[PDB]
Amino acid sequence: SEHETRLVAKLFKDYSSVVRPVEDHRQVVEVTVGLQLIQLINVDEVNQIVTTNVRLKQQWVDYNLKWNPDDYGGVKKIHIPSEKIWRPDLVLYNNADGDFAIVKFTKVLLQYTGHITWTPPAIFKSYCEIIVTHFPFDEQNCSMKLGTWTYDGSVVAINPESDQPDLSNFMESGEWVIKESRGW
Amino acid sequence: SEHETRLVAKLFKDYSSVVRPVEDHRQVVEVTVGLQLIQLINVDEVNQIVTTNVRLKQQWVDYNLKWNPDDYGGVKKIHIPSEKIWRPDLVLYNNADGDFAIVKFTKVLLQYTGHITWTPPAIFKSYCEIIVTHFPFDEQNCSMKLGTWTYDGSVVAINPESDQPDLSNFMESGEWVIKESRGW
Amino acid sequence: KNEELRLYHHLFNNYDPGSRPVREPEDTVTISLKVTLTNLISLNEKEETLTTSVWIGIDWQDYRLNYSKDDFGGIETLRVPSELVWLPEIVLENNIDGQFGVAYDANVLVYEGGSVTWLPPAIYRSVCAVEVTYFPFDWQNCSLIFRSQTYNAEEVEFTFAVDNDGKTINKIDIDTEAYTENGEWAIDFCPGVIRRHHGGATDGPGETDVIYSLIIRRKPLFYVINI
Amino acid sequence: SEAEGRLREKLFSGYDSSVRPAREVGDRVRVSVGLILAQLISLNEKDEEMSTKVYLDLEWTDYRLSWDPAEHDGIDSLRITAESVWLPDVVLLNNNDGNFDVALDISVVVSSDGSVRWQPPGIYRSSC
Amino acid sequence: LNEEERLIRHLFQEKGYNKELRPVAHKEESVDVALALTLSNLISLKEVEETLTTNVWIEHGWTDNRLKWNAEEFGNISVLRLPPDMVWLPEIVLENNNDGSFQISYSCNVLVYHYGFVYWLPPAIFRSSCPISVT
Numbered sequence: 001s002e003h004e005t006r007l008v009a010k011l012f013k014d015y016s017s018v019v020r021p022v023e024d025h026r027q028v029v030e031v032t033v034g035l036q037l038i039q040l041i042n043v044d045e046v047n048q049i050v051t052t053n054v055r056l057k058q059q060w061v062d063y064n065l066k067w068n069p070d071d072y073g074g075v076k077k078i079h080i081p082s083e084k085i086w087r088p089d090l091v092l093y094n095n096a097d098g099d100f101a102i103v104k105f106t107k108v109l110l111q112y113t114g115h116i117t118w119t120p121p122a123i124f125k126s127y128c129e130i131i132v133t134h135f136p137f138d139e140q141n142c143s144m145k146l147g148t149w150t151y152d153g154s155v156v157a158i159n160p161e162s163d164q165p166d167l168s169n170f171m172e173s174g175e176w177v178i179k180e181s182r183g184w
Numbered sequence: 185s186e187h188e189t190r191l192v193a194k195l196f197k198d199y200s201s202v203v204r205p206v207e208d209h210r211q212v213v214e215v216t217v218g219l220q221l222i223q224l225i226n227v228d229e230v231n232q233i234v235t236t237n238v239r240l241k242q243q244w245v246d247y248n249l250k251w252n253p254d255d256y257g258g259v260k261k262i263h264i265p266s267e268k269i270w271r272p273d274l275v276l277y278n279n280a281d282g283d284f285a286i287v288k289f290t291k292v293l294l295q296y297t298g299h300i301t302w303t304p305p306a307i308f309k310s311y312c313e314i315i316v317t318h319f320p321f322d323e324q325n326c327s328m329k330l331g332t333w334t335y336d337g338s339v340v341a342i343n344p345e346s347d348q349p350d351l352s353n354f355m356e357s358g359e360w361v362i363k364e365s366r367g368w
Numbered sequence: 369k370n371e372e373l374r375l376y377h378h379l380f381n382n383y384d385p386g387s388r389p390v391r392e393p394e395d396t397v398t399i400s401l402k403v404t405l406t407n408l409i410s411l412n413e414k415e416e417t418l419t420t421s422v423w424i425g426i427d428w429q430d431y432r433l434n435y436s437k438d439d440f441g442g443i444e445t446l447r448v449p450s451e452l453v454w455l456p457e458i459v460l461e462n463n464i465d466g467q468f469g470v471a472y473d474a475n476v477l478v479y480e481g482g483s484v485t486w487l488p489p490a491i492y493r494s495v496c497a498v499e500v501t502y503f504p505f506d507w508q509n510c511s512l513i514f515r516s517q518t519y520n521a522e523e524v525e526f527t528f529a530v531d532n533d534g535k536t537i538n539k540i541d542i543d544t545e546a547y548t549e550n551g552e553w554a555i556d557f558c559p560g561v562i563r564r565h566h567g568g569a570t571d572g573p574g575e576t577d578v579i580y581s582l583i584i585r586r587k588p589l590f591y592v593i594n595i
Numbered sequence: 596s597e598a599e600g601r602l603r604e605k606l607f608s609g610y611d612s613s614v615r616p617a618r619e620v621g622d623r624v625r626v627s628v629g630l631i632l633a634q635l636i637s638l639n640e641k642d643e644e645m646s647t648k649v650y651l652d653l654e655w656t657d658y659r660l661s662w663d664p665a666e667h668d669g670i671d672s673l674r675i676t677a678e679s680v681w682l683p684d685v686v687l688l689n690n691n692d693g694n695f696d697v698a699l700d701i702s703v704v705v706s707s708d709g710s711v712r713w714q715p716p717g718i719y720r721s722s723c
Numbered sequence: 724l725n726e727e728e729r730l731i732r733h734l735f736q737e738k739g740y741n742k743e744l745r746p747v748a749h750k751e752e753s754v755d756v757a758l759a760l761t762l763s764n765l766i767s768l769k770e771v772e773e774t775l776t777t778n779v780w781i782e783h784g785w786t787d788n789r790l791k792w793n794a795e796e797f798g799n800i801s802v803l804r805l806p807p808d809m810v811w812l813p814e815i816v817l818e819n820n821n822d823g824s825f826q827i828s829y830s831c832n833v834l835v836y837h838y839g840f841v842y843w844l845p846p847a848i849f850r851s852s853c854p855i856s857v858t
């Protein structure tokens with residue numbers, strides 16, 4: 001694994017995490033965003049807050065984090081601390097009383113092409129308008145608005161990974177049934 | 185402060201907090217341990233947890249932290265941050281849902297002879313078998329097991345400062361009376 | 369001159385804790401796992417949360433941290449901070465409070481021959497769906513799922529630790545003398561299983577984890593006497 | 596604020612914030628301790644604890660942090676991050692929750708004669 | 724992003740930006756800080772604890788003449804996103820909190836425009852003292 005040590009020393013010698021990772025500043029950073037819902041922890045009807053456990057899969061290419069595997073003993077992917085690189089600053093725009101942004105800075109998977117996949121965990125506490133007219137037989141539409149807090153579309157573009165949230169690893173709830181889910 | 189400034193700069197020039205503080209690796213670090221009970225915060229019978237406020241006086245000798253006072257203007261004792269030095273890693277083995285080790289890193293008093301006293305505070309939440317047979321007239325024999333988590337007796341030895349916990353600064357409890365106390 | 373300092377500078381002057389301890393990228397790191405439960409603090413039915421105190425025992429090999437006692441004055445063990453060595457980054461995946469890691473970053477013990485042992489303690493709050501049908505005369509099946517947060521099954525794999533006789537410890541270990549039973553919950557069973565999945569062609573890299581299943585029985589005396 | 600930058604560089608060259616200021620061995624540092632009560636938050640009878648919001652008022656002299664204003668564009672005082680200077684380790688001894696320290700470290704006000712005034716906020720839960 | 728990399732090197736390393744010092748020519752000058760508040764949602768008003776919980780976006784605007792550049796000498800760049808720990812900040816706090824969280828929750832990037840204006844919009848969750856009139 002001395003190849004990986006040499007490679008990581010090479011990639012971060014003159015690297016800047018402040019700067020957006022594309023070759024020309026007039027270009028846009030294309031970020032693919034997908035949400036995986038692990039658990040619907042609780043719905044608070046009084047304060048109108050939905051707390052969930054999620055994984056926020058973010059994919060983007062970093063122009064300066066590329067290498068030839070043949071020059072580094074066949075290494076084609078590595079794991080890097082997320083604090084070290086530039087990241088999109090996704091924020092839950094309708095956060096109720098939780099964290100606004102990602103606080104668990106797990107490692108990113110970096111490919112030799114420069115593609116970065118980062119799947120941080122998060123507990124999202126969102127503000128959901130609760131209609132109690134038909135409580136206990138009520139139906140609640142709860143959204144999670146996500147966006148780059150400080151970057152506008154002309155510098156960083158976000159696109160959905162899928163038309164729907166990923167519910168493949170969703171833990172069953174004893175209080176709610178998810179009829180429909182969708183990302184726009 | 186010029187004398188102590190120069191002394192500290194000398195002491196931590198070539199210092200290592202990783203290795204044990206002995207001239208010879210075949211020697212044992214002799215640590216004197218004394219528990220002082222400041223307050224008995226709570227006895228949770230349902231979850232079987234005893235919450236106490238304590239001071240964990242730890243005394244040992246660091247071989248490499250010695251100096252001649254005459255070479256430093258007569259300075260015979262100093263106070264230094266505890267995070268810079270090797271420490272014993274005392275852990276509450278029967279911790280229930282609190283902190284396993286010391287988390288409040290207060291200053292150590294260092295003598296010119298290498299003697300270190302370190303009296304950090306802690307909130308101990310100790311798991312203890314609670315017998316409720318005679319409640320409300322119940323007696324509870326609770327315990328706090330302390331030890332060096334990663335060091336065995338062949339490399340680090342712990343000895344009690346006294347046969348009994350120090351109750352000299354114990355605040356009176358409005359719910360409990362300490363009939364007996366002892367360290368083994 | 370303390371030989372521990374010489375050994376420490378010999379093993380760590382040129383050492384990268386960010387790279388796995390493998391000579392080739394395609395090699396796998398085998399991690400021996402044991403999980404010891406010291407206390408079952410509670411099962412909160414309203415939040416569906418199991419609170420436990422454990423210590424995880426993680427053993428592996430790091431060829432870069434290999435030394436002989438004869439060349440270092442007979443030292444057979446070196447304690448060093450866990451931050452200086454590569455770690456498999458084992459986490460509880462099914463936590464409910466956002467706490468994935470261990471409670472206290474204890475020292476790793478580096479033995480001669482490249483063997484690395486890490487024994488961190490932890491307080492875990494895990495998801496346990498409560499089957500209410502026979503409450504308070506109920507039994508529950510609370511899972512503890514452990515997996516590397518970073519590495520896939522080709523990069524890090526798991527095996528169970530073995531006792532002195534060599535019998536595989538495919539269960540939660542409990543020290544009988546030091547164990548105090550929870551006031552409301554008796555631990556009837558605690559098997560462990562290493563699962564491997566998502567190795568299909570479409571799925572791509574394989575994934576693995578270790579699931580322990582605490583089968584716990586409520587002691588219903590309080591509800592019988594009082595309600 | 597180039598004059599302030601030069602003054603700060605002069606003051607913190609060779610300064611050790613972990614060393615108590617005593618020009619001679621045996622010199623005691625006199626610390627003046629006062630308290631401003633912003634709010635009496637509560638007195639919990641169940642937990643037997645008083646919760647208050649306060650500003651401490653700590654004053655002491657540090658001879659190392661003295662200068663002549665005439666040589667520094669007439670700067671008679673500075674505001675410095677508290678972690679940059681030596682602080683007296685004044686804590687609430689009778690706290691009930693394990694928290695000994697102040698809520699926010701903020702900044703000290705240092706005068707040209709070495710006088711240091713520090714007024715950190717604190718939310719304290721004390722045993723009553 | 725060769726041009727923003729060059730611009731950041733020019734602003735912070737070439738000219739030696741010191742974030743500890745205020746953006747003033749003389750110590751006797753004061754820095755004008757403009758403040759606005761946007762209320763995202765009123766979380767609650769707990770009467771028993773007499774606490775107001777709010778989610779607020781505080782808009783801070785000030786001028787830092789050390790952070791000026793000609794957009795045409797740097798590839799027509801007109802705005803930069805920077806971590807807040809690189810620049811001097813006018814540390815504004817909620818004075819009348821009752822839990823000890825004096826500061827903003829998420830320290831987002833500052834926006835620095837070529838004419839020296841620093842825009843900063845940190846969001847925050849605040850728990851403040853609200854005495855309750857029960858009459």
Ligand SMILES: *[C@@H]1O[C@H](CO)[C@@H](O[C@@H]2O[C@H](CO)[C@@H](O[C@@H]3O[C@H](CO[C@@H]4O[C@H](CO[C@H]5O[C@H](CO)[C@@H](O)[C@H](O)[C@@H]5O)[C@@H](O)[C@H](O)[C@@H]4O)[C@@H](O)[C@H](O[C@H]4O[C@H](CO)[C@@H](O)[C@H](O)[C@@H]4O)[C@@H]3O)[C@H](O)[C@H]2NC(C)=O)[C@H](O)[C@H]1NC(C)=O
Nearest residue numbers: 508509510511560561562563564565566567579581582583
């Ligand atoms: C306490 O809680 C634990 C955890 O929930 C319980 O253990 C689990 O019990 C389940 C049964 O209730 C087990 O699931 C069955 O496993 C059988 C084992 O046979 C193997 O099947 C493999 C097939 O692929 C597996 O892996 C893929 C991974 O991608 C997965 O998608 C598949 O679904 C499947 O799990 C095969 O490769 C292997 O060689 C074995 O043959 C399996 O046969 C069962 O399948 C039957 O039932 C399902 C029902 O949906 C049906 O669709 C199938 O056609 C078939 O009839 C189950 O999958 C699970 O593995 C246990 N987990 C462990 C032990 O880790 C435990 O029982 C609980 N204790 C109590 C209640 O006392």
Ligand SMILES: *[C@@H]1O[C@H](CO)[C@@H](O[C@@H]2O[C@H](CO)[C@@H](O)[C@H](O)[C@H]2NC(C)=O)[C@H](O)[C@H]1NC(C)=O
Nearest residue numbers: 429430431432433434435436438480481482483
């Ligand atoms: C750590 O180093 C020792 C010493 O080099 C290794 O032990 C040797 O193993 C080889 C075979 O691989 C034998 O030929 C030698 O005789 C052994 N020792 C001596 C005296 O050289 C040991 O295998 C190494 N461990 C690891 C994990 O690589």
